[PDB]
Design a binder for this molecule. Structure first.
Ligand SMILES: Cc1cc2nc3c(=O)[nH]c(=O)nc-3n(C[C@H](O)[C@H](O)[C@H](O)COP(=O)(O)OP(=O)(O)OC[C@H]3O[C@@H](n4cnc5c(N)ncnc54)[C@H](O)[C@@H]3O)c2cc1C
Ligand SMILES: Cc1cc2nc3c(=O)[nH]c(=O)nc-3n(C[C@H](O)[C@H](O)[C@H](O)COP(=O)(O)OP(=O)(O)OC[C@H]3O[C@@H](n4cnc5c(N)ncnc54)[C@H](O)[C@@H]3O)c2cc1C
Ligand code: SF4
Ligand code: SF4
Ligand code: F3S
Ligand code: F3S
Ligand code: FES
Lengths: 631, 257, 111, 131, 127
């Protein structure tokens, strides 16, 4: 049974009411508590910095060289806030309504209101930290408009807003490292969660330079470990992004909330071959002034500019005549995947479609188009070697964000007491579709203005200390991790780790991707365990354990991905409806939009690990909407 | 393309390293440099040899952990990009590419091409921030920052911490990284309360970490992926002179953990 | 028949409720609209400046040589606001009460 | 300032002689009726400032007309006009419509009639009588 | 260059009573053009200098002041006005007794902007 622990009364005061009713830790008693923060992204860095400022002992971990190398440094779009600095009707209630409707009424309302309500404090904190947001000539902040909003509520730092947000959070974290309140352990990968007496009391990590397995103990554990969008091999995420931490916590007892809720990006630079695994995404606004097409002849060897207009298949124009050229991201991207699966060969591997700007360049001013997409066109010419001004730009959809993750309550706590999941690692308050510029705001809200209160509420009700790393639970988890690493290194199979990851991601993108049906998901559910067995019998992980073995880290991540993908496929087969990014082909409107079943699927599916990867236990958390009625 | 690679191979920090030659018969011009290294690593793994280890997360030129000295230039022949943003169309058939790590005393080599750039972390920890705590910030529009100052501070703040300035500096100096952070924080009204302390601390930390001095050569700016200018170093120099005039002395150095 | 279109509920939130319940034009769609503003006084200049900032196409008119010659320029007394900067009991409700009673109960309360 | 201005306008020092005053019409809080959206009875016609009746009642308080004009311009009309415009399509009416031609013909005829009367009384004489 | 809705609290930035009084002295310019008419050179220096001084004595005009003076001065050149010989007929006929200290302030601003290498923008062409 799941307790969301949401407050009562008017939604506008619930957070304040909760903040009053929560317990507190005295500043003198905070030094007696140790908090482990796995993750140093926006959520993790903000959380560790705020908790170190509070006076706790913080153990922060990351697998990168530096805490600043996390994902979310790559976030290009701005960060939203309900400040109404543009005098355009924006408000905290309007942001909360926009986020509840954008997620297709699949998230708790109290969480979304609290996020929209603390966005303003987020922006104040970031400006104070020195984040060089865009200013107008009068010296005051500048806003722009993001997709899914009719207001200009987005604060941006050129095209690298996420970099500057993470730089501010990382500078606060560095200040706390200098203060001695936070201990940073870069290049350290959490490999297991240690649960003592039903509480998340520690972690088991592996230092990826020396190969050393270390056990750390804490009064509370925070999992700010980002999303699992790399279960699809081809994704816009960083190469190291993984699901190891949340999957280990899930196997330890944390419930996975809506794993199948995955987001895509429409405009991503396609791969040039089987070697590539990362798709560099480009603003969805690139489509606003471009047309998507493919040659009618599959064996067209001519240059795309030399193809006549009558010989171009301008799909999304013939298909979907209504809302042409600005079809929603999911419909357009499903069409793109269908076209590429039919067989066209417009790119190296045939996975791409021509987003041409020739008619927009002729119609508009090439200088104005330069002012609009100069950095994007220069990056595209750097990556592909082709000028988008003359040659059409090839794009292909890719998995971008995972709205799912570990289920958390209003206190951001999972089903394991003392385990807190923040950022993209939890399901939380994006529902079935995350709005633009809302993941940065969610991570910074969880870090700066929510977890400091809810973790203190948890810690005030327990005694500090009392669990050391010499406990049998730590030894059992460490033995399990050592055995897994030895088994991975000892298989000495024929296929590489990336081969298995590529096969798994191809299956997940074909079956549990953007277009899902019952038969395809059942085929994937039959195929996933076979790929897992083939991995565990025929993978090649060279090197040793006590060395900088990057193949070993990739092998562990893929071993977790193989189990996570089965749960994702089971969740997608379970949800007999379409909502947001989760699209079932048999539940849709004639226009191709998502058709929800709010009578039978208006809940959060939290899945419990039962020891069998094929039969997890479903726990429904009912959703009630009192302020934003579904429509 | 047929590409020959002379790659530095070092077992660990203590083991001496050497250049190993690897011939790649088929290299796609569209292949990125790191993707070509990935293909080589897959070939080595299939052949039973140890794959080359290099740092990489984002493959977008933003995170900053790709760090390769390619053909004598940090981040490769092409400027204003990173190692990940460098593609094989920048080379020719039959070319020989020498791949190295960052060479600096303060950037110890942990593996074949992986270095330890935590000295940059400790330079940041030595005052490279604004000592503002969560909850105490005023309204975001209370202090006006001119668009010119904000633009210059964003130009400096666009620093991915790759360490390529240290690698291309003949003295092994972190002056471009430090000067970029000093300029970013000193161009904003929020960084005024600490700036003259901060520069001193940061400069002292760069001395403590083992970096060299600045001869005003300019290879740092030549190889910077983000085209951080030498005006950042001029600004840091002005700040340090002003801090010396005010008698500002550095605090205790940030010792490694 | 005249529809004042005043919002319901407590008077203190009515405007906010109205601002939520009224429709918006996307910033990209604002350039498609042209708004004529006849007048360049405090009201007209304020409106034209704000609507030009929003992104609309504004046609502002005045009969004088310059927009600055409107009769608002001739106003000598100050401008009221319910900021209570003097610690004298002023509030938004007190200003609203003062304006309703001063107008002699002949105007809509919500406005 | 008041005494110096009075001495500039009348030529008499009010420190010795009495000042002379007379009531004059100052403000009109009537005007075109507008709703909460500052929109008149004609859809798409918005009246702001002193031109509308709005919210001064039967007596405008001091320092409230500048308040009302700046409020209508800066913080009310941007919202209500966007509310109106979001419910209609942009464009669709040019100055070549017959309504524009009819209004222009009426204005031209009025101006020609005014110029063609050639009476024995000035405009300000009639305005003075009316006032 | 402040847009509607983005302004902070009216008491966030203190303006000294002396600076406020001087900026109100300069801001009291009715734009009559009598400075141009009485100037032997036909120069708009008193009008431009009054606006420059009004916006440069307040903190809110600091972020864009050295640009503004340059632009404004360039515009006065572009529009066809003459130069300033420091004669003072403009101040003699000014209805609002705007002083030549405004022109000295504009001159200080323009010299400071030249030291900073501030380039005038594109002139405002008529509609
Ligand atoms: C190109 C791009 C653009 C984006 N743009 C936007 C945007 O405009 N707006 C927006 O709202 N969102 C955007 N996003 C999404 C968003 O910025 C991030 O993807 C995410 O929401 C932030 O993740 P996080 O802060 O929770 O943690 P992350 O940033 O993902 O960091 C997780 C951390 O966990 C650490 N870690 C340590 N040990 C482990 C372990 N064992 N397992 C896993 N991790 C471990 C990692 O080192 C890392 O530091 C974008 C994403 C991409 C790829
Ligand atoms: C002498 C005086 C002193 C005042 N002092 C104060 C005071 O101290 N405090 C206070 O609160 N109020 C004061 N008021 C009242 C307040 O200033 C007025 O309500 C103010 O004029 C309202 O401004 P407005 O924008 O509505 O219109 P106005 O300021 O009158 O501007 C009207 C604009 O519309 C233009 N216009 C008009 N007709 C046409 C047309 N047919 N075609 C094109 N353009 C046209 C005009 O050129 C002008 O630009 C005073 C009024 C006067 C007369
Ligand atoms: S200053 Fe430039 S070269 Fe040096 S670390 Fe920063 S981005 Fe890299
Ligand atoms: S004479 Fe005085 S009031 Fe008139 S325009 Fe010149 S400076 Fe302004
Ligand atoms: S190259 Fe070296 S000498 Fe200074 S200017 Fe750059 S750090
Ligand atoms: S009279 Fe003319 S020359 Fe200058 S000081 Fe006045 S504008
Ligand atoms: S991998 Fe991130 S900068 Fe190259």
């Amino acid at each position: 049974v799941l307790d969301s622990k949401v407050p009562t009364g008017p939604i506008e005061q619930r957070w304040d009411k909760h903040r009053f009713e929560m317990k507190l830790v005295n500043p003198a008693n905070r030094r007696k508590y140790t908090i482990i923060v796995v993750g140093s992204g926006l959520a993790g860095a903000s959380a560790a910095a705020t908790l170190g400022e509070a006076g706790y002992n913080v153990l922060c971990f990351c697998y990168q060289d530096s805490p600043r190398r996390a994902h979310s440094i790559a976030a290009q779009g701005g960060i939203n806030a309900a400040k109404n600095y543009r005098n355009d009707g924006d408000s905290i209630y309007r942001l909360f309504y926009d986020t509840v409707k954008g997620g297709d009424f699949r998230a708790r309302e109290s969480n979304v209101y609290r996020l929209a309500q603390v966005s303003v404090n987020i922006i104040d904190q970031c400006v104070a930290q020195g984040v060089p947001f865009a200013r107008e000539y009068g010296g005051l902040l500048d806003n722009r408009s993001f997709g899914g909003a009719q207001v200009a509520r987005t604060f941006y730092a050129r095209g690298q807003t996420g970099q500057q947000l993470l730089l501010g959070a990382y500078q606060a974290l560095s200040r706390q490292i200098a203060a001695g309140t936070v201990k940073m352990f870069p290049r350290t990968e959490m490999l297991d969660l240690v649960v003592v007496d039903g509480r998340a009391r520690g972690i088991i990590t592996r230092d990826m330079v020396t190969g050393k397995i270390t056990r750390y103990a804490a009064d509370a554990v925070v999992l700010a470990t980002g999303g699992y969008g790399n279960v699809f091999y081809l994704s816009t995420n960083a190469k190291g992004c993984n699901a190891t931490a949340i999957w280990r916590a899930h196997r330890r007892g944390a419930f996975f909330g809506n794993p199948c809720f995955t987001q895509i990006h429409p405009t991503c630079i396609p791969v040039s071959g089987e070697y590539q695994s990362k798709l560099t995404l480009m603003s969805e606004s690139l489509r606003n002034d471009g047309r998507i097409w493919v040659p009618k002849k599959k064996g067209d060897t001519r240059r795309p500019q030399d193809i006549p207009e009558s010989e171009r298949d301008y799909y999304l124009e013939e298909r979907y005549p209504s809302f042409g050229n600005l079809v929603p991201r999911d419909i357009a991207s499903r069409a793109a995947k269908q076209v590429c699966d039919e067989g066209r060969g417009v790119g190296p591997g045939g996975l791409g479609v021509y987003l041409d700007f020739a008619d927009a360049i002729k119609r508009l001013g090439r200088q104005k188009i330069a002012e609009r997409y100069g950095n994007l066109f220069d990056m595209y010419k750097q990556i592909t070697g082709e000028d988008p001004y003359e040659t059409p730009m090839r794009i292909y959809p890719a998995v971008h964000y995972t709205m799912g993750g570990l289920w958390v309550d209003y206190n951001l706590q999972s089903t394991i007491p003392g385990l807190f999941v923040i950022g993209e690692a939890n399901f939380s308050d994006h529902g079935a579709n995350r709005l633009g510029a809302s993941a940065l705001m969610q991570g910074l809200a969880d870090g700066y203005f929510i977890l400091p209160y809810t973790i203190a509420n948890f810690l005030a009700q327990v005694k500090p200390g009392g669990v050391s790393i010499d406990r049998p639970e730590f030894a059992e988890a460490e033995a399990e991790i050592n055995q897994r690493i030895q088994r991975l290194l000892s298989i000495r199979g024929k296929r590489t780790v990336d081969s298995f990851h590529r096969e798994l991601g191809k299956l997940m993108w074909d079956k549990c991707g953007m277009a899902r049906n019952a038969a395809g998901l059942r085929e994937a559910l039959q195929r996933i365990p076979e790929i897992r067995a083939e991995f565990w019998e025929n993978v090649n992980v060279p090197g040793e354990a006590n060395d900088l073995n990057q193949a070993l880290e990739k092998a562990g991540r893929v071993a977790d991905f193989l189990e996570l993908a089965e749960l994702m496929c089971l969740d997608a087969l379970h949800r007999e409806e379409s909502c947001g990014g989760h699209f079932r082909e048999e539940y849709q409107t004639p226009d191709g939009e998502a058709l929800r079943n709010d009578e039978q699927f208006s809940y959060v599916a939290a899945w419990e690990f039962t020891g069998d990867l094929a039969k997890p236990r479903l726990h429904k958390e009912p959703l009630v909407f009192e302020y934003v009625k579904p429509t | 393309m047929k590409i020959t690679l002379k790659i530095w191979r070092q077992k660990n920090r203590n083991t001496p390293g050497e250049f190993k030659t690897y011939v790649m018969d088929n290299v796609n011009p569209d292949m990125s440099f790191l993707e070509m290294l990935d293909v080589l690593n897959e070939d080595l793994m299939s052949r039973g040899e140890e794959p080359v280890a290099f740092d990489h997360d984002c493959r977008e030129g933003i995170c900053g952990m790709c760090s390769l000295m390619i053909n004598g230039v940090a981040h490769g022949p092409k400027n204003a990009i990173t190692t990940c943003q460098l593609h094989m169309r920048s080379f020719k058939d039959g070319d020989t590419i020498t791949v190295e790590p960052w060479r600096a005393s303060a950037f110890p080599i942990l593996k074949d091409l992986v270095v330890d750039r935590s000295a940059f972390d400790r330079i940041i920890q030595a005052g490279g921030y604004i000592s503002v705590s969560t909850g105490s910030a005023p309204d975001a529009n209370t202090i006006p920052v001119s668009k010119v100052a904000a633009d210059r501070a964003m130009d400096a703040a666009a620093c991915i911490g790759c360490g390529a300035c240290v690698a291309a500096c003949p003295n092994g100096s972190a002056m471009l990284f430090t000067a970029a952070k000093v300029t970013h924080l000193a161009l904003l009204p929020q960084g005024q309360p600490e700036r003259y302390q901060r520069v001193v601390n940061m400069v002292a930390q760069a001395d403590f970490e083992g970096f060299g001095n600045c001869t005003n050569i300019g290879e740092c700016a030549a190889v910077c992926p983000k085209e951080i200018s030498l005006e950042t170093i001029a600004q840091l120099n002005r700040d340090l002179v002003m801090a010396a005039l005010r008698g500002i002395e550095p605090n205790t150095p940030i010792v490694p953990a």
